[PDB]
Design a binder for this molecule. Sequence first.
Ligand SMILES: O=C(O)[C@@H](CO)OP(=O)(O)O
Ligand SMILES: O=C(O)[C@@H](CO)OP(=O)(O)O
Ligand SMILES: [Ca+2]
Ligand SMILES: [Ca+2]
Lengths: 436, 436
Amino acid sequence: AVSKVYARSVYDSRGNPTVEVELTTEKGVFRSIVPSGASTGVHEALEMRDGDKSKWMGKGVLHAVKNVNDVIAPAFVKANIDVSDQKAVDDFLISLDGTANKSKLGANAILGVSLAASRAAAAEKNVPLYKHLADLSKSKTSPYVLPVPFLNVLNGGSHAGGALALQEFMIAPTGAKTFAEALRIGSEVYHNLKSLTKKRYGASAGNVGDEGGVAPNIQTAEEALDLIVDAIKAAGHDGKVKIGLDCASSEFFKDGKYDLDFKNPNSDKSKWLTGPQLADLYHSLMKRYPIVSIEDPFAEDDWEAWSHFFKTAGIQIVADDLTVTNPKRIATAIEKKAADALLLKVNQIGTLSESIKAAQDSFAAGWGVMVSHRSGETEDTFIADLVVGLRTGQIKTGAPARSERLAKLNQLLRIEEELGDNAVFAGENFHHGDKL
Amino acid sequence: AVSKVYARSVYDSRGNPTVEVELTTEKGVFRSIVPSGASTGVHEALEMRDGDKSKWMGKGVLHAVKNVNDVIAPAFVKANIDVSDQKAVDDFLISLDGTANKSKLGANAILGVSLAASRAAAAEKNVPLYKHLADLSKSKTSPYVLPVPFLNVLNGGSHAGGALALQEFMIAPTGAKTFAEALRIGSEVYHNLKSLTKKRYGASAGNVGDEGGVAPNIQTAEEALDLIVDAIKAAGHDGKVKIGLDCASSEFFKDGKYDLDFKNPNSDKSKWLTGPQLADLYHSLMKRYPIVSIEDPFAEDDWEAWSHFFKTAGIQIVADDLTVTNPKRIATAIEKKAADALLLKVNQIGTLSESIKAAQDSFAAGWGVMVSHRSGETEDTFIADLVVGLRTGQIKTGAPARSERLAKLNQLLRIEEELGDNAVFAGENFHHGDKL
Ligand SMILES: O=C(O)[C@@H](CO)OP(=O)(O)O
Ligand SMILES: O=C(O)[C@@H](CO)OP(=O)(O)O
Ligand SMILES: [Ca+2]
Ligand SMILES: [Ca+2]
């Protein structure tokens, strides 16, 4: 039974405060650390920020922490909830908040308790977290599916100087036979890429962005793509490694058009593209490079551009800012046949129950699910057991650099080793890992 | 009693393989993750690298892992050693290796077992790791000393483009009243610094180096120092924050002289400095900026330059490459009155026993001890409990960015909270935290 609920302020990988929750039961203390989210959000669960400019640049979570300690904890202990019943935990939490976006107690306050309980439930059950997550989500267990990690290697857009408007370039080692192998290959690709970068762009070009990829001053998409292909080649892994893109196109959508030189800042408006011209540019890149996945190709409300594109895309199309892990948005996306994969962010919705349901509805529509990290990550490895539990076959948790990233990948290495013959690597089948 | 000893290959924060050890006793499984070291080392414990260019760029640890699994594990289990007796554990390990630099089994193979055992011992004892570390090192426990964190904020030298020859600029929040406060202040300084950098040097300048600091193209020491002072000022923390430098001067020592423009590469040799001219430059910086600590001011064998300088320095002088956590080197350093603080790196010596002894001998000579991280860190938080256990009052574990860094700082936040009135923040007294 849960005897105590406590929260403290700890630090995320960007040096900003975040909430850490500790839950006590007769089996010990279970902890969870929440990734940074949005404190301002239409369609997404709102995390609570103190707003006191005199402390942590206005990013404290002291209120959030108080909410846990002073509001939830006592109500929670007295409720006598069975942690094995995740939905009862989550329904309790939600009912306490009373708002649609968790803006009363905060999504950061609520998620921390929701995930800790799942750790307490597995412990109680005497099973590894991923098996308990598999039970909650009613996923197939024979075998378990290890995911293809979509490793960030290079950043553009708002995350770099240079003219490149596309935000993230990932490598996906789909041709490996095991998680361990996929990870070794991805790291060698990454190290070759860091060598090439430093050689071509300067010592400076080798420093990393928030998720661990390089961010050199690049002008075009072809420039970024050719660099990556060179790296794969230099590593000796031609054909075993594919590319994934995160266009984050909401960032350069202006006036019904897309500005590919949005950093300009004398951008020639005669050069802005309509959804359809943009789709032609993507098709061109897709014919010349081994791209297998494109995230947010079009803006967050540009429904017609997604649909159109979806009709001839032929590769996995990931909804991130279009859906913000929001069920009403997902249902819309499904209905309009806008894409076929959801970027799942547990803190964008606020509870484990609602995260698992969002994935199930995706799976039910034949969509794939990519479990994702956040910009501001922690040493918490929760999403590693969750990706295995959900059997999605694909995770986006950063480059093979910075331990808030490696903590997850390291955890997948342990899970694989632990499963023995009961695990399969999604490989080329990452899109439908759930159905393998 | 220890029933099993197992090792696996996991990844460090730079994407290179490292060894992870798991030790089983009747109290559970205790794990340790070793930081990356040197595979080539005069005066230091050698870590074992596979050298197979076809796997991980020749950085695998498969041999190291085999050494643990096939050599140590069986010998170790059969020996029936009491984990509470750290020295018996370490003596056993050393005797198995049989070399002065652990080059038979590897320092990476040996350290992993040596630290896991200490976790197993604390568990057995029913105490937090830091209390067990305090017991082993015979440190004062009333109160416990929380350290001033020496946060990396900006890198130069071999770690950046630009002409700046000094390798690391740290900030030490000595004027805070608690660990929690010191950390909040350091983070605000750091965030202001990242703002200023991006504003003055470009979007690119904001990417981070291996330890989390920025590495913009800077020309001079004064340029770096003025930036940092601006950041402290902008954060509103003037007077509560000091500066620490890591000169890594072995890197620009050539021909009995020091090249401050070693990246040149048409360096005017008439401009190289002798130990004494170099000391005059340091004195100049020390008069204009709040520098409280200088690491490796002079080259690793330039005994006379250290001594000379030590006579009028007046601030803490840290031995890193001069001593490489090597007892014979430490004794020499003490004897020649070359400095008064040791940078302690547990993996440079290979066992917990020898690390604790190196610190004790330092303390006995009136030296301070700065526990240090490594370039390639992990999610393991061992050095956080060790710094508290040793009561050193000072830790160098990176900038407030990248979780292989924050994992340690987050852990110090928990320890502080746990100690209540039994903890003091070293503050201005960091140099002699042991004597507080
Ligand atoms: O997936 C992520 O980590 C990023 C962008 O893809 O999202 P956010 O920055 O909002 O966390
Ligand atoms: O202290 C550290 O982290 C660095 C430099 O100060 O040492 P190394 O790169 O050898 O780990
Ligand atoms: Ca995205
Ligand atoms: Ca150093």
